[PDB]
Structure formats: C-alpha cells, structure tokens
Amino acid sequence: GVIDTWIDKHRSIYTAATRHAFVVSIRDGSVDLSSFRTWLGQDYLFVRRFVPFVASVLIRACKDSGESSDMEVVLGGIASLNDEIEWFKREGSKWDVDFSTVVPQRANQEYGRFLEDLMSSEVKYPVIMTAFWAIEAVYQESFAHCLEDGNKTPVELTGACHRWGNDGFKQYCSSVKNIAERCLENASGEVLGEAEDVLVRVLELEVAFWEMSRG
Ligand SMILES: Cc1ncc(CO)c(N)n1
Numbered sequence: 001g002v003i004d005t006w007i008d009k010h011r012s013i014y015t016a017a018t019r020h021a022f023v024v025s026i027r028d029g030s031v032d033l034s035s036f037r038t039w040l041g042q043d044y045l046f047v048r049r050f051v052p053f054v055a056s057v058l059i060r061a062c063k064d065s066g067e068s069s070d071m072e073v074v075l076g077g078i079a080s081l082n083d084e085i086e087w088f089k090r091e092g093s094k095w096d097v098d099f100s101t102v103v104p105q106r107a108n109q110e111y112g113r114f115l116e117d118l119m120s121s122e123v124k125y126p127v128i129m130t131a132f133w134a135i136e137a138v139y140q141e142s143f144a145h146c147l148e149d150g151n152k153t154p155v156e157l158t159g160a161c162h163r164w165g166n167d168g169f170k171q172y173c174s175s176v177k178n179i180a181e182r183c184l185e186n187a188s189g190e191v192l193g194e195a196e197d198v199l200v201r202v203l204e205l206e207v208a209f210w211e212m213s214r215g
Pocket residue numbers: 043046047135136138139206209
C-alpha cells in the first residue's frame with residue numbers, strides 16, 4: 001500500500017527510528033540502568049504531550065468523518081494512554097526516577113513543538129492520521145520480539161516490553177494503519193506529499209529522541 005511504499009522508500013531512517021528504546025547492560029559487575037532511566041524520564045514527558053495531540057486527532061476523527069468508526073479507534077488509543085501514564089508513575093516510584101526533576105532535552109522539546117504544529121485545524125486529516133499511526137507504529141516495531149530478544153540477554157527489564165510488545169498493541173497499530181491507509185488512498189497528490197513529509201519528520205524526531213538514551 002501507500003504507507004508500505006513510503007517505509008520501503010525510507011527504509012534507512014525507519015530502521016534508525018525503530019531501534020530499541022533503551023539498553024540494559026552489565027558494567028563493572030553491576031546492572032547499568034542509565035539508559036533505561038533516561039528513556040523513562042524523557043518518554044514520560046513525551047507521553048504527557050502526546051495525550052492532547054491524540055485528543056486533537058479524536059476531535060478531527062469525529063468531525064472529518066468518511067468513516068464513523070474512526071472515533072472508536074482513536075478513543076481506544078487515548079484510553080490506553082490513561083493506563084500508560086499510571087504505569088509510568090509506578091515505574092518512576094520503583095526505579096527512583098523523579099519526574100518533577102526530569103529536564104526535557106532538545107530532541108524532546110522539538111518533538112513536542114512538532115506535535116503542537118499537528119494540532120491545528122489547518123492540517124489535513126490524512127496527514128494527522130499518518131503522524132498518529134507513525135508514532136504508535138515506531139513503538140510497536142521497536143518492541144517487536146522484545147521478550148525473545150530480552151531472554152537472549154543476561155539481564156532484562158520486562159515492564160516496557162509488556163506495554164508495547166504485546167499482541168493487543170500490535171493489533172491496535174494495524175487498526176490505526178488501516179484508517180491512515182484508507183485516507184491516503186483517497187488523497188490528492190498535494191495531501192499525499194504532505195503526509196509523506198510528516199511521516200519522514202516523525203522518523204527524524206524518533207532518531208533524535210532515541211539518541212538521548214542510547215547505550
Ligand atoms: C518517542 C516515542 N515515540 C512513540 C511512542 C509511542 O507511545 C512513545 N511512547 N515515545
């Protein structure tokens with residue numbers, strides 16, 4: 001399809017963007033949590049900003065309705081975010097990450113302003129859906145096979161893997177893809193170019209975000 005074609009075209013940045021969110025390794029005989037704790041702090045601040053952006057997609061889905069059922073897909077997405085935020089707070093407490101002292105880094109602030117740019121009614125529905133799909137799908141790709149990979153490493157943390165590695169989140173992403181894909185198959189050349197640039201921009205922001213916590 002249209003999205004699959006863009007991913008192929010842009011395979012290189014898509015691979016770069018979907019590397020593991022954090023690495024847990026042994027250092028000097030201890031488990032090094034520095035990459036995990038950096039990711040947790042930064043990603044929690046990203047998720048708090050992702051919430052109103054999904055809220056804006058939900059509104060658009062209720063008004064810009066070629067399909068009635070788009071709303072329920074986005075609504076399930078935002079309801080998951082509720083459970084996600086609670087999970088993040090539970091992680092912060094068990095791992096001593098104080099979210100009130102996390103400083104959002106450059107890549108995180110850039111990503112947040114970009115989410116703001118996508119919240120305007122001046123942006124076309126197919127473009128907003130592409131961005132929403134992409135942000136979700138990069139987490140699905142990056143956590144794919146996390147259990148089996150994690151089992152092959154000497155120490156693994158299991159929490160994040162349960163969150164984005166499960167079949168429920170995979171199926172969710174597919175259902176969001178099906179919506180984006182439908183919008184793009186009815187889109188003009190101009191909107192199609194806009195959607196592709198937005199896809200590319202999400203991948204670029206994800207590479208930069210990833211670089212904050214790399215091992
Ligand atoms: C940076 C980033 N991209 C995507 C997601 C999907 O939730 C996330 N949590 N964080």
